[model samples]
Target: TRRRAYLWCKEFLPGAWRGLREDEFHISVIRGGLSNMLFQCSLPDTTATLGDEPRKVLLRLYGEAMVLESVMFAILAERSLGPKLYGIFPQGRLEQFIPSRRLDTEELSLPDISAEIAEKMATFHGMKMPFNKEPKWLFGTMEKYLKEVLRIKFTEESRIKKLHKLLSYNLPLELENLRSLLESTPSPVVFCHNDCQEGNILLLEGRENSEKQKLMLIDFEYSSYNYRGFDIGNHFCEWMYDYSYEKYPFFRANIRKYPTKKQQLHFISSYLPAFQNDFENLSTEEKSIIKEEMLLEVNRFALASHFLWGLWSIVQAKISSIEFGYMDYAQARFDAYFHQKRKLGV
Candidate 1:
């Protein structure tokens, strides 16, 4: 907005921003937000009014998104687990605008960065939000999206053509199959950042923070109480895909880019800090058992990650305003799920 930044800043912000005029506001659009638009609003660089207050702030506009977003964000921010929160109003909250860039899809597997992300994931999963603790949200969302996907008449695309693709997965059956597959795998239920792809992670070099906390995660739309297995599993499945492709299909899925056993072992072990501390002398014998079982749980749940994500993308194909090809993405996810299933012998 031309003056919306000034208007919101004056109403909700503290320090020098409270008295700034509309013309004094410097606003720039930030990309990578799919559900909510983000604006980088700053005071004019040399302004006398820019005293001790933060010169820059992030303005998020949420016409509609998860209600739990603010709730969880406040808790995460309070615990210093997420972006610091600032002002809140009807539109959205003003957030601490961290000077950073997103971690690249290509960078997800690098050993140093990989271990950092896993450590962050371990901490992230330990958080508890002020809400229900059921693991139902994942499958609940899948079924809701499943209903939406089926309800799309597809008359717009020569009806006969659409049914052929629909018949392939027998979408409903696949969800049930994944559900049954997960029953045997007993895994911890933790508060998880269910959506843990590369885009959701931030790499901060410009700011000073903990050496280990350099990588911060954002976008908690899908964050909730869920299987710890699914959180790590889902991230591993995303290792091969890059969403930078802006053309028809809108992403690159390199099946071969999936994390290797060595890579997965490094990440999983890093995540097990407690186990590492406990087994310093008896590392391999004791740690290996948990690691092997952990790997099994993560891989098994990764299939559900693939299957359920495929269903949601199919729904997004119809409802999302973004230009990406959600249907094509869905098909690719299913292909990966099926491909991984046989390989994992699920």
Candidate 2:
């Protein structure tokens, strides 16, 4: 099966390139990608005098066109975040060469990157940019995807329905509250990378004027507009799934070195200063309620993340053309993650 995937990769790239020969192309997976295929390749390059060295490059292949739209938004968003956005190609494909060490859960779990990751997210959320004229058709689109997953060999309708209902009921009320908060905040409308998973952010080692340690946000396929809370909540939700909350792996075995609840509040407070006029507009009661809403919504967001991951795993399991019981495993893991969250008072 993997061989088939590999063959398809070659065919897909070359067919579009008009029979151009690619020298020494290597196809290797990068990890944690759910909906699309990722590969790293090498090309032949020989200039006059400098010995023979192969040029290695990365190419992202698309199964859909959504990524193209995302790249367009990301190019603008990166103005505020400093992540490179190298335009889009046909059928959702993008080309860029990132010279950096590959990051896995363990590497990204490190304190420095993890903390900066959170800080970068704050910067994205703190942006103030003009909104698009129309509203996001998110709920409907998500429902459609869920329905498609359900149509394909999914038997656990009850749990799926329950998750849907939970999010459905919560979204309207949550959006209302978020809108209220936004109304009170003097925050500007700006770009947001709706999907900023660890895999998408890159840290490259290069010779740049004192900015070697600079981090760049990559992959703008899911960038969108909404409230800052959604951006903040989704990221923390992802961390929770990856167990970033646990101290041992994330913080070199010392949780105390990480941000405290007070510190987190302080960080949020830093974010609020941009919207100070909006903050003063809120009554104390409203502020308290908004805070509570955020805490609760974060858990809800985490629950949804686990559930979707499970469902997505099931989708792949079906398409895998194998007898693996990953569908059961995924559904079970989904249920387990949610139940554990409930037990933890999420």
Candidate 3:
């Protein structure tokens, strides 16, 4: 694998290989990426300069994602929405490395951190994506995943009953209502990071004299042109689970930490500020109206997150080699769907 990676670098990053020996190149596996293998490849600076840093780049195992997503990657790199891309190859890609750490569950609830995430998400939603808008994308993906899960034969009778109960609901009716609400609502369609979980958000430590950390959203494999509300809704739903926990049925310990109405307003207020004075100049009634609208919009679309991820977990149960409990995870998501729907009067 070392020799293969070395040859790959030589072929794809020829400019970086000039006057560099194989010993100068180093490869280390990155901790995340359940769907793809990730590595950090770098070369030390042998120059006389004392303060310069070493050359570094990120490598992702190719073929794990659709070929078309390469276009999205390029756009993200170009827009600086993600890391810079140095080169692309059949085996993998070379990307600019950023010094950062993944945000934890507690960190995600912080007011400032949540506000910054809202700002970044707004910027992402405002971009022009390479793909056409698919308003039915949420439902479409769910149906596809359902079909795939149904194709697999399960020996567990309890599992079959559980699956049947979830499917027995008026899924079609709920989806139709959701579609109509989204269409009639004022939320605009835009490019979205469909999966904005904490693991995908990076926090680069602040430098001297600047205590504020910088945040960057990564992993665009699920990104596409979609409803703006779904993007934010999905992120809010992600506040429940912390994947870093290591144990069987990894999601069993998940804490349903859905944000309060006030917290949701604070986030949306940042994404869609009512005034240049940050809503201070607006009438109380005007601010109340905006909050009510955003709350309803986010609540309606939050169902999409549960349905999408519920079916996604079902499919992963069938095909994913990862040891995590996909079956339990699927059940959890569907249960949450019903719970949230009842609570929101949806």
Candidate 4:
């Protein structure tokens, strides 16, 4: 009766779940990630670890964001981008667990990790992205979601609504200005792992050099080629917006802790070289478009960092156990970024 299970076992995992003797299951190495479930299992009755390295297979359960077929086709087309798919979950199942060691945000602060991440992103984003012209209706999906789905989470009594109200008022003109800028410019589109949040990138050990690292970009659900700045700006929002610049000065002061501006520059600098040739070929309008996109990115984070700070304070404060800190940081970013906009004349 398990048609999907039989098919997956035959196609992706040949020996998996076969000869199921009760005692053969030993332990599962759990991979902690925000999206999919990954597991590494040890076989009993044999000490062999698949050439002494352990047999590893990844399992994925589809999520709402990744339910579309286009997302899977994009990754499937790019073999060099990331790990190969192993198996899909049984039909009707929406979520599955995986095995992975959770990499702490603090770990990414190291110079090597930071530098390597930049270089790795070079490869990750370098794949030749083939796309048909996006439908005119694509933008409508986001508009609908923001109005229908995202807004529903926030009733008037909900903190999310309050945050949204604040963002709507404070950042209105800035977003309009940015929108106008983007409309006048033509920016090239490429494949983007839309959510390049630090938590989504995983570092693995190299075979020869213990110090060497390989970066794996996970969670392709949000992957698309809309604006490169989205990736960079998103990371900045996650990293820099966690604390207030007035009190803690995350952007100004904490950036100093890195010891060199070049290290921080690595994040965006790596993207420049590859697109260098593309830049020269771009039309003036295209150049303008990219600039507008950058400003749009600013508009996004300007509101997002502040809005999330307030919203999360009310929603997730229980886990963070730090009240008022994130909101303070958000307000600081809102002010500082406003100044940046003024300087850029946006």
**Predicted model with the maximum lDDT:** 1
lDDT of 3 by residue, 152-209 (tens): 6667886677667666775556556656756666666788889998889988866322
lDDT, candidate 3, equals 0.74
Full-model lDDT, candidate 2: 0.48
Q: All candidates' lDDT scores? A: 0.81, 0.48, 0.74, 0.46
RMSD of each: 2.5, 8.7, 3.3, 7.5
lDDT of 4 by residue, 1-346 (tens): 2343333443444354454344455434343444344444334555344332225443443313435544454455356455554454534221122333434555566656665655555555566655443532223433332333233344435445445554564443543554565455444455556566556776554421435355556666656555544455545545542223344323331422322334445544445545464664677787666555554553443333333333334343223433344333444545555554564466
For 142-259, candidate 1 gives per-residue lDDT tens digits of 8888888777755567433644586566888888988898888998888888989999888887643555657888888778889899999999998988999868777999999999
Clashes of each: 0, 7, 0, 17
Q: How do the predictions measure up, each by TM-score?
A: 0.92, 0.55, 0.87, 0.61
Off by over 4 Å in 1: 32-35, 48-51, 64-66, 158-163, 207-211, 274-283
Task: State, as a TM-score between 0 and 1, how close model 1 is to the true structure.
Answer: 0.92
Among these predicted structures, which one has the highest TM-score? Answer: 1
Clashing pairs in 2: 128-188, 128-189, 128-190, 129-188, 129-189, 129-190, 184-278
